[PDB]
């Protein structure tokens, strides 16, 4: 797949904030989250998450934030024909 | 005369963070406040904000999705000088 593009916006003693910009069909690659994190979606739409429990399609809504814990392990894919963006705030 | 209030909606409030969506009517403001925590601002709207601090007033240009951080201790009033609603998500980091 094409690669999603992470841009780190903030990396201080308290948080690391990364913008993830997905081209259509783009993926993060598999990773494991080492920190609790908050997601602020900048786009409304579905994401495809490959997870240890299998494939999960999730609905994100622009401007509706949510949090997930340290230990989440997955590959995130943009299953749409448009760009998808979200901001991820990892708590240190 | 009084500017309309910006409206806070708490999205997350847990051991680690408090995340509040702030929605500004046209011309709207926060009122003066003091930030008790380091915080992250994720703008949801591209546009100017007018920031009133003890020393003066400045126009700051925000871009949707371009975050920034400010430290504990900020004292200000924040105003939306535009003719349309301005929205940002504020992530306060608990100690
Ligand atoms: Zn992830
Ligand atoms: Zn403030």
Domain count, chain B: 1
Q: Is A87 helix (H, G, I), strand (E, B) or coil?
A: strand
Resolution in A: 1.8
Of B16, B42, B93, nearest to A87 by CB-CB distance is: B42
Euclidean distance between CA atoms A80 and B6, whole angstroms: 34
Largest separation between any pair of C-alpha atoms in chain B: 39
- Say which experimental method was used: X-ray
Cβ-defined contact of A42 to B64 (cutoff 8 Å): yes
Confirm if B88 and B45 have CB atoms less than 8 A apart.
yes
φ and ψ at residue B26, rounded to 5 degrees: -50, 130
Cβ-defined contact of A91 to B16 (cutoff 8 Å): yes
Going B32 to B33 to B38 to B43, the CA torsion angle's sign is negative
Q: Is A75 helix (H, G, I), strand (E, B) or coil?
A: strand
Sequence-ordered list of residues with C-beta below 8 angstroms from that of A7, at least 6 positions apart, any chain? A18, A19, A21
In CATH, what number is assigned to the domain containing residue A66? Answer: 2.60.120.10
Cβ-defined contact of B67 to A42 (cutoff 8 Å): no
CB pairs under 8 A between A and B: 61
Neighbours of B15 (CB within 10 A): 7
Q: Quick one: CA torsion of B74, B14, A64, B23, rounded to 10 degrees?
A: -40
User: Domain residues for A49?
Assistant: 1-92
SS3 content of chain B, % helix, strand, coil (to 5): 0, 55, 45
Q: Quick one: CA torsion of B48, A19, A16, A62, rounded to 10 degrees?
A: 70
Which pair of tokens denotes residue A29? 């690659």
Judging by beta carbons within 10 Å of its beta carbon (0-12, 13-18, 19+), is residue B6 exposed, middle or buried?
Answer: buried
Of B12, B67, B93, nearest to A9 by CB-CB distance is: B67
Of B14, B16, B42, nearest to A40 by CB-CB distance is: B42
């Amino acid at each position: 797949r094409p690669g999603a593009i992470p841009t780190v916006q903030i990396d201080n003693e308290r948080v690391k904030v990364t913008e993830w910009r997905f081209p259509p069909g783009g993926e993060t690659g598999w990773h494991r989250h080492s920190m609790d994190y908050v997601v602020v979606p900048m786009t409304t739409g579905p994401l495809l998450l490959e997870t240890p429990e299998g494939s999960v399609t999730s609905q994100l809504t622009r401007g509706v934030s949510y949090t997930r814990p340290e230990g989440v392990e997955h590959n995130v894919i943009n299953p749409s024909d448009t760009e998808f963006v979200f901001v991820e705030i990892e708590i240190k």
